[PDB]
Symmetry: D2
Subunit: 113 residues, 4 copies
């Protein structure tokens, strides 16, 4: 089942006081325009050196080094680094996982269909 | 025991995409200056009509109507409304709970000692 | 909004390994039978000295000392202790909150209507 | 940072009422005895068709079909299925992730070193 997130947010607030994130995926199109080639998150967490896994149509493309968190707080995942130098035809399913370096845990942060 | 909040934040991020809060307590002093008379949170949640309970030195002063969330995102709790028109000597312990209107749950968001 | 509890359960599992609870409310009827006089939880947490608040029809009856966690893992809340020695007519709304002694937080664990 | 799990457990309790799990890893040794060949969890979740990924010394061995949840509530991960038919020398690091089929999320449930 599911549960309301109110108690979790206030528990988080009491512990960390201040938190701002924005994982709204901004998908970048490549060449040709029907190719998805990047995804950008406007405000990522910065407390650890997070890395990202990409899965295309059920195929695990693995993990690559992260581009930097930029001064505007954003972080870009370049799918060319994962897909042998190519973007991804936008008919495919794309899933992007962030990886917690303390555990190896994978959490979905972007999905395209 | 305790647990790392990483998995909870990313689970929250996936669901709500964007969240910014700041419950760093800004304590206001009154008359005399050794009296605590308000507490202000710079960026509160706005998804529900949250209310606040105040407890002073183990005595539950109860719940009062909320002042508004202001255009800068802040919300003020005026202890005069709870303590029969008086501020609170700063030697006391003060605890402020936010109340989830869907459940009646109380969550600590500010403590003075 | 809400979120799936899967990630929270597995995060909990990794940290505590083993957990069993059962807060299915067992409501006891008193004299007359149309009075609710107790509520029992079959398997409560035992890591802290939890206490309970009772609210009847919007009136906060406050907190009382806990009866013991029994050898079968159960814990009983006797509404007579909270309501001046009387049970509660079953037309009323009843809400039972458990209180975390580390924070003062109140969490709903039983509601009657 | 970290946070106390009290609020999460009681939020879970209110929603699901009853929950029992036990992910204490029981490691099985193979042939020779210095090989780790299985890991068993005494009481797994059963609400979804969870699958497991195994990582040995930083190498992702991938995902395989799950053995069944047995009538005693247990579930076994046979490392022979993941490691080309072989157990794992117990000097290696082994990490077992459970995978949420709704999201693809990976959560650590067992680690050997």
């Amino acid at each position: 089942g599911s549960m309301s997130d109110t108690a979790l947010i206030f528990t988080l607030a009491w512990n960390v006081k201040q938190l701002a994130f924005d994982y709204t995926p901004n998908w970048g199109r490549g060449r040709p325009s029907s190719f998805i080639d990047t995804v950008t998150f406007p405000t990522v967490l910065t407390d650890k050196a997070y890395t990202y896994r990409v899965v295309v149509s059920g195929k695990d493309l693995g993990v690559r080094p992260s581009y930097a968190v930029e001064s505007d707080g954003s972080q870009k995942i370049n799918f060319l680094e994962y897909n042998s130098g190519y973007g991804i035809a936008d008919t495919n399913t794309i899933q992007v996982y962030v990886i917690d370096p303390d555990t190896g845990n994978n959490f979905i942060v972007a999905q395209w269909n």
